[PDB]
Each structure stands twice: as C-alpha cells, then as structure tokens.
Amino acid sequence: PQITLWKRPIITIKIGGQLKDVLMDTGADDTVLENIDLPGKWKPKLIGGIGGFVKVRQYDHVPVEVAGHKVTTTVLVGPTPVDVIGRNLLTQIGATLNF
Amino acid sequence: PQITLWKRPIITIKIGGQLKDVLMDTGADDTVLENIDLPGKWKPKLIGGIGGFVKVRQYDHVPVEVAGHKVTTTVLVGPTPVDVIGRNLLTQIGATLNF
Numbered sequence: 001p002q003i004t005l006w007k008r009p010i011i012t013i014k015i016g017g018q019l020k021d022v023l024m025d026t027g028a029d030d031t032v033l034e035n036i037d038l039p040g041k042w043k044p045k046l047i048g049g050i051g052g053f054v055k056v057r058q059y060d061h062v063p064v065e066v067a068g069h070k071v072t073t074t075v076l077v078g079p080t081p082v083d084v085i086g087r088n089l090l091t092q093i094g095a096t097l098n099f
Numbered sequence: 100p101q102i103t104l105w106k107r108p109i110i111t112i113k114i115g116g117q118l119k120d121v122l123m124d125t126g127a128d129d130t131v132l133e134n135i136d137l138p139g140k141w142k143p144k145l146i147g148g149i150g151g152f153v154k155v156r157q158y159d160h161v162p163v164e165v166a167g168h169k170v171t172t173t174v175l176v177g178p179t180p181v182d183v184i185g186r187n188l189l190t191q192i193g194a195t196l197n198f
C-alpha cells in the first residue's frame with residue numbers, strides 16, 4: 001500500500017500468536033510494545049525516548065507477520081505510551097518514505 | 100524521492116534563519132525542536148512519549164523550508180534529545196509510507 005499521513009499510520013501485525021495494532025514509526029530505531037506475552041529468555045536494554053532513558057526487555061528472533069510477510073525480528077517490551085514498529089521491522093518489509 | 104529505512108531519515112530544515120537536522124518521523128504527531136528561539140506568542144502543551152511527558156511551547160504559522168518547499172507550520176519547542184518533524188509537516192510536503 002501507499003499510505004498518506006493525515007491519519008496515524010497504524011497497521012495490524014501478528015506477534016506471539018496475537019494480533020496487535022501498531023504505529024509505523026520512522027523515528028523509532030526499534031519495535032516497542034507494552035505488556036505482551038512473549039515466551040523465553042530476554043536481555044535488558046536501555047532505550048532513549050523523548051522523556052529519557054527507559055529499561056525494556058529485548059526478545060530476539062520473534063516471529064511476526066506484517067503486511068503479509070512472515071519474518072523474525074527483535075522486539076522490545078516495556079513502558080511505552082504507544083505500541084510502535086520501528087525501522088528494524090519496517091526495513092524487513094521494504095518500507096520506504098516517499099515525497 | 101524514495102528513502103529506504105535502514106538509516107535514520109535525517110533531512111535539513113530552514114527555520115528561524117537556522118539550518119537544523121531533523122528526523123522525518125511518521126510516529127510524531129507534530130514537529131518538535133529543542134534548541135531554537137522563535138518570535139512571538141505561544142501556548143503550553145504536554146507531549147507524550149517513551150520516558151513520559153515533555154513540556155513544550157506550541158508556535159503556530161512558523162515559516163519553514165523543507166525538501167525545497169516553503170510553508171508555514173506548527174512547531175513545538177522543548178527539551179527533546181532529538182529534533183523531529185512530524186506528520187503535520189510531512190503531510191504539508193506530501194510524504195507517504197510505502198510497503
């Protein structure tokens with residue numbers, strides 16, 4: 001699809017067996033969601049948001065389906081006011097910003 | 100132009116007689132810049148992100164130039180660690196996401 005930006009660019013992905021609505025965020029390096037149920041081990045990561053640096057859980061090799069592509073990706077889980085998919089996943093699906 | 104996302108999408112904008120490097124950010128509802136003095140009246144706003152709320156000043160109808168287009172636009176000014184242009188300005192220049 002080609003999406004204009006008058007509305008927030010939200011799409012539905014499948015992650016850890018669940019459908020989740022997520023904002024496509026070109027200013028995010030990483031994909032971050034709050035309070036999702038992902039199995040297995042994780043490591044601590046510190047990310048810097050607009051308000052400061054925040055501790056999150058980093059899950060590697062997570063199967064996601066986005067825009068009908070099935071990939072594996074890194075997913076961070078932690079306090080965020082919006083569940084976002086960042087450039088790590090947007091590049092995986094070949095997304096571009098056009099103008 | 101068509102920008103892939105393996106890199107952060109950083110463009111220059113001319114504003115307030117300054118040249119600033121800004122992230123083109125589909126996750127930001129509105130542009131926010133840290134180090135800049137803009138003339139005139141403004142209204143206080145809180146914006147919400149990772150790490151909590153940030154207090155900003157909202158300036159309306161600010162002349163800027165980005166991607167070769169002169170427009171007037173809403174600019175938020177406050178202590179963001181990274182300057183971004185948001186969907187308000189991206190829509191004024193016809194930016195879209197494609198995947």
Ligand SMILES: CC(C)CN(C[C@@H](O)[C@H](Cc1ccccc1)NC(=O)O[C@H]1CO[C@H]2OCC[C@H]21)S(=O)(=O)c1ccc(N)cc1
Pocket residue numbers: 023025026027028029030031032047048049050051082084086124126127128129130131146147148149175180181183185
């Ligand atoms: C979290 C989003 C809903 C909102 N943010 C825009 C977002 O693109 C920020 C923009 C951003 C970028 C860098 C530093 C601060 C803010 N990126 C961000 O927080 O990304 C985090 C996830 O990946 C990591 O890589 C970058 C920081 C981490 S935001 O900066 O809080 C923001 C909120 C409201 C407005 N009007 C403008 C910006």
